Design a protein around this ligand. Sequence first.
Ligand SMILES: NC(=O)c1ccc[n+]([C@@H]2O[C@H](COP(=O)([O-])OP(=O)(O)OC[C@H]3O[C@@H](n4cnc5c(N)ncnc54)[C@H](OP(=O)(O)O)[C@@H]3O)[C@@H](O)[C@H]2O)c1
Ligand SMILES: NC(=O)c1ccc[n+]([C@@H]2O[C@H](COP(=O)([O-])OP(=O)(O)OC[C@H]3O[C@@H](n4cnc5c(N)ncnc54)[C@H](OP(=O)(O)O)[C@@H]3O)[C@@H](O)[C@H]2O)c1
Ligand SMILES: O=C(O)C(=O)[C@@H](O)[C@H](O)[C@H](O)CO
Ligand SMILES: O=C(O)C(=O)[C@@H](O)[C@H](O)[C@H](O)CO
Ligand SMILES: [Cl-]
Ligand SMILES: [Cl-]
Ligand SMILES: [Cl-]
Ligand SMILES: [Cl-]
Ligand SMILES: [Mg+2]
Ligand SMILES: [Mg+2]
Ligand SMILES: [Mg+2]
Ligand SMILES: [Mg+2]
Ligand code: NA
Ligand code: NA
Lengths: 319, 318
Amino acid sequence: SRPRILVPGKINPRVLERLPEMFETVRIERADAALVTADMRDVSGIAVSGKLPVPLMDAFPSLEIVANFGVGYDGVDVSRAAARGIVVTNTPDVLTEEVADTAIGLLLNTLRLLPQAEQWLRQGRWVREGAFPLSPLSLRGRTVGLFGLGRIGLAIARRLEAFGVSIAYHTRTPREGLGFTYHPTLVGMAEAVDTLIVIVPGTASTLKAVNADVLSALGPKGVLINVGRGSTVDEAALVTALQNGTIAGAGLDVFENEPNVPEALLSFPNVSLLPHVASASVVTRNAMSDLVVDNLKAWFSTGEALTPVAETPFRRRAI
Amino acid sequence: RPRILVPGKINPRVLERLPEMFETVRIERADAALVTADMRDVSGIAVSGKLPVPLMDAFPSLEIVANFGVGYDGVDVSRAAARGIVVTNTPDVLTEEVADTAIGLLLNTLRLLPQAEQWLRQGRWVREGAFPLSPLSLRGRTVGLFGLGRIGLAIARRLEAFGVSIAYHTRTPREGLGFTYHPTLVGMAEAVDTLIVIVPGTASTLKAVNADVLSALGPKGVLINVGRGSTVDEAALVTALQNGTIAGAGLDVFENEPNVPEALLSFPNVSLLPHVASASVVTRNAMSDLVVDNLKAWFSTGEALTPVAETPFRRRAI
Ligand SMILES: NC(=O)c1ccc[n+]([C@@H]2O[C@H](COP(=O)([O-])OP(=O)(O)OC[C@H]3O[C@@H](n4cnc5c(N)ncnc54)[C@H](OP(=O)(O)O)[C@@H]3O)[C@@H](O)[C@H]2O)c1
Ligand SMILES: NC(=O)c1ccc[n+]([C@@H]2O[C@H](COP(=O)([O-])OP(=O)(O)OC[C@H]3O[C@@H](n4cnc5c(N)ncnc54)[C@H](OP(=O)(O)O)[C@@H]3O)[C@@H](O)[C@H]2O)c1
Ligand SMILES: O=C(O)C(=O)[C@@H](O)[C@H](O)[C@H](O)CO
Ligand SMILES: O=C(O)C(=O)[C@@H](O)[C@H](O)[C@H](O)CO
Ligand SMILES: [Cl-]
Ligand SMILES: [Cl-]
Ligand SMILES: [Cl-]
Ligand SMILES: [Cl-]
Ligand SMILES: [Mg+2]
Ligand SMILES: [Mg+2]
Ligand SMILES: [Mg+2]
Ligand SMILES: [Mg+2]
Ligand code: NA
Ligand code: NA
């Protein structure tokens, strides 16, 4: 009858609310193949946030589609999905402006120490000790390099244009038409700028791209902001750079092994840390939920997904 | 050399540069009781915050008050004008800094970023999972600026890039801009869901953001105050927040700094800052420079750099 969709582990309840429009939902408490039972072998689709282990994906012989919750889909083995003729979809565009907003807020919090200033006030220190100390850093006069200048990178750049800072970017291919300075290497951009915003996907090509050399080039007024994926930053090298004063500060929304954050990173008074919140408003998460479900609905009703990923430009063949 | 009184705390850069032309007289607080007989020849004051009239009037030869800050409501400018005393402020050098902070405060209010960071730092990510989704967002908002001066315009320029509708209220419209003018504050409040306060703290703005304005702002309403605390009816705001009349607030300034009402500290939908909008090293250094350069210009040329509107004065010396 109706296609059966597996939802492994946690997902926004709006996905679960709307799947009954067309589907039966099969739930397992974590993304683990050991929890797959014999009566689940007819599942035809997955809706998932985060990791989809290959053994779990491969437990389903009739699987046609993985609808990833999020624009980043590095938790899905897209190479393996493609090899099996399985379409993978993501949630681009509906979160672009939200994530760009968060990126700017994180940058300002990192530079001006706004969260720290609020803690000073809330702990009664304004009354008892007087003004919060002046922030050594400011956005004024900074030069910002965007590592990534895609949907979200461009949206961040557009915001930054209005703040009166210089904007440069690094990507594998330049985007002609824009009036921003292209750098063909990450390290060369880092040299040239004092503020590096990371907004690339977490792929093999970006793994630990922000390394000791890049951090050294960024320099002693350097501020690193990561709103992409944790894997793109060498977290150990960042902790070392911060400890040595190789750079001035950092703002991070994403980490190597979420929800674990290394103890050393928590120590620094010149670092802002967020628990992967860049898209995490009710409105934007509702829109992401809608796009996951609408991808599944489009696939099963029309054979054409709404937002398939680049690696799987597929159309449904019904078997 | 002219003698300059500096009452209470001020950026040390002011104190460092005064010796370029002046003798400095320091008192520990802005209090007339600390004025001694040998201070009666003072010709200028450099001050941050309040300058009580009894202190200002302890100096028969006073010519100039150089206010640290673009806001100068702590100086009784009417009294200064009556005495032929020029008052200067520090516009422009802090405009972009303050606009930056305003945007950061707005985003922190809407997205709860400081609370999300506390969730992480307190170990709750691990044991309790994701930080709750923020009920609010900037997406789809309509922002009304109360004030569209040096700083208000700079805020509006930033907001243009965030894809929100922009409106403003001032006593006189600024032609040439493509923003919607509202001739009344309450009418703007009706029309918008986000109100950014960036007017001076004058008689005309005292408690302008009152119960009616907050009610018009509405149940999705967010109030951001980066102007002066006096402009918001703080008691009415607490009531509005408590009742859900509005959705949230971000405040850098308060009625009776550094005191913040305990009720405001209770709300999970409020961001509070201890008057930090200009408080970077670079911007405070520029402000300090402008205070001193105003005094130097006055005594050397007879023309201040940035006198306030109420005192368009030129020096008369014998
Ligand atoms: N923190 C959060 O909550 C959050 C939320 C949403 C998204 N994200 C992350 O942000 C990422 C970007 O999203 P998006 O929508 O902007 O994606 P997108 O439109 O595909 O942009 C990706 C950008 O990265 C560049 N890039 C990719 N690989 C590169 C490499 N090896 N070296 C240099 N540049 C490289 C791309 O240009 P080239 O192909 O020319 O190199 C492109 O400019 C997502 O993949 C996700 O991981 C995080
Ligand atoms: N939080 C902080 O750290 C911080 C830092 C800097 C400044 N401030 C505050 O920001 C204020 C604004 O600075 P600014 O440089 O932008 O000043 P500005 O250029 O003089 O602008 C003041 C604006 O407020 C409007 N305004 C004044 N009285 C009004 C009234 N009764 N009703 C409606 N609009 C009114 C003015 O327009 P009309 O005259 O045409 O009405 C003008 O657009 C300062 O006075 C200070 O109190 C706070
Ligand atoms: O869209 C993205 O890629 C994100 O980073 C977040 O919005 C998702 O919640 C996350 O990716 C789920 O893994
Ligand atoms: O410039 C202003 O008006 C300010 O609000 C701050 O930058 C000052 O530090 C403070 O107001 C001095 O009273
Ligand atoms: Cl969610
Ligand atoms: Cl598994
Ligand atoms: Cl200061
Ligand atoms: Cl007094
Ligand atoms: Mg998850
Ligand atoms: Mg590409
Ligand atoms: Mg005016
Ligand atoms: Mg003369
Ligand atoms: Na550099
Ligand atoms: Na309203």
